[PDB]
Amino acid sequence: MGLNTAIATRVNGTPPPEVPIADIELGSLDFWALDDDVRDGAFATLRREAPISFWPTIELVAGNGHWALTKYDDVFYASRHPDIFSSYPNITINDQTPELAEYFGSMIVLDDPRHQRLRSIVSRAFTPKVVARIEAAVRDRAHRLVSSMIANNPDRQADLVSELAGPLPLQIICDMMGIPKADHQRIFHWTNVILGFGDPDLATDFDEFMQVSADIGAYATALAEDRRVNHHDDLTSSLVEAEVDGERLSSREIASFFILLVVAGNETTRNAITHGVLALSRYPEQRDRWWSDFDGLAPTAVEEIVRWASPVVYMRRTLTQDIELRGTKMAAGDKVSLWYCSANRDESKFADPWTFDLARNPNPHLGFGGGGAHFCLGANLARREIRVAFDELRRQMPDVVATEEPARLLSQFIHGIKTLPVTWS
Ligand code: HEM
């Protein structure tokens, strides 16, 4: 009904309501359904009263529980000490088998030296011609998707997720890899079934999920085998040709890197853009400031959108040895969860953490993690994707605004918005 009228604004800088520590149940799915004000107040209570605490996994096999690190300094320290806080082979709270974790996770589930081998050769594949292709695709696909929003919608209403934030990062990944247009339908279907496993409200058939995950891997392996014969100016070809000290990637390694990208390089940028449109809709003075000086404010605006959205809520590690932090003794083998959503509101680190300030500087947020060995390999591409999406909104539909509160994804790991209706003139 009200899909033609702007959502309520909020007063910028307002802290979340006080949340009693007894109300906080990180191991309960019902807790993850509470809205972001209750969640943000919950992590505020933990930072203040119980900054390291142990929680059960969400069940629905219950596994071992995890120590939640909620303070910026603890998440930073854990990120920079991977010999103690290991990523091998699990980076979510629920454990996967090592072979499945490596198949879907590529370098993100490895420690050095295997991680550094893989990351160094992948990094070398981002050659000048490949980077030029990627940068042209970001602008082409953002411009087309926003133009299509206008062409497809005489009522000037659309769902930002389905029409812009959802397709943009996966179309860019298709273009970067050199995937033909005619294969988008298969890549989107496979990717949507894989992502859907992360949504407990969307039925995921197990057999269908295993078969799409085999097919997408076979598809990327065949794409790499073709580029071994036929060099194109795309990332698949530079991945097959890249070499560090004689070491080269197998086609199987390339395929798993692609499977990592269609999740980790895709739903994260989607949610940064959708939370950024939500935030501009709640704080229109920030939208006005940015539009008044788009290029001058873009570098700090994009970082503040990532700090504010924290699209990756947490990453997990596993202790290789006993450690005591803040007086809390944790044992070798224990799970540790690193709450970037909470680090990104830590009052010791950020002046006025509840203010959404697109001029914020400095902004040492941990939305791409705490830094160190696994620091987001796509961070510069994500920053460009965010900037150019907002640039195309500003150029083509500058008053675009959310018209209904978002439908939120029920997830502990992904700060997901499933739908965000918008309207424009
Ligand atoms: C706003 C969007 C994004 C966010 C918030 C995000 C966040 C993250 C985080 C938190 C990590 C783990 C960092 C750590 O453990 O210390 C990560 C890793 C990674 N991300 Fe991103 N990411 C985004 C976009 C992208 C994009 C666009 C790409 C590429 C298309 C990408 C590729 C990767 C890769 C390959 C890794 C694994 C790096 C490693 O293990 O060494 N990310 N990202």
From Swiss-Prot:
Binding site for heme: C376
Reaction(s) the record says it catalyses: a methyl-branched lipid + O2 + 2 reduced ferredoxin [iron-sulfur] cluster + 2 H(+) = an omega-hydroxy-methyl-branched lipid + H2O + 2 oxidized ferredoxin [iron-sulfur] cluster; cholest-4-en-3-one + 6 reduced [2Fe-2S]-[ferredoxin] + 3 O2 + 5 H(+) = (25R)-3-oxocholest-4-en-26-oate + 6 oxidized [2Fe-2S]-[ferredoxin] + 4 H2O; 15-methylhexadecanoate + NADPH + O2 + H(+) = omega-hydroxy-15-methyl-hexadecanoate + NADP(+) + H2O; 3,7,11,15-tetramethylhexadecanoate + NADPH + O2 + H(+) = omega-hydroxy-3,7,11,15-tetramethyl-hexadecanoate + NADP(+) + H2O
Functional pathway: Lipid metabolism; branched-chain fatty acid metabolism
Entry cofactors: heme
Keyword Cell membrane (UniProt): no
UniProt-listed InterPro entries: Cyt_P450 (IPR001128), Cyt_P450_B (IPR002397), Cyt_P450_sf (IPR036396)
Gene Ontology BP annotations: cholesterol catabolic process; fatty acid omega-oxidation; methyl-branched fatty acid metabolic process
Protein name: Methyl-branched lipid omega-hydroxylase
Organism: Mycobacterium tuberculosis (strain ATCC 25618 / H37Rv)
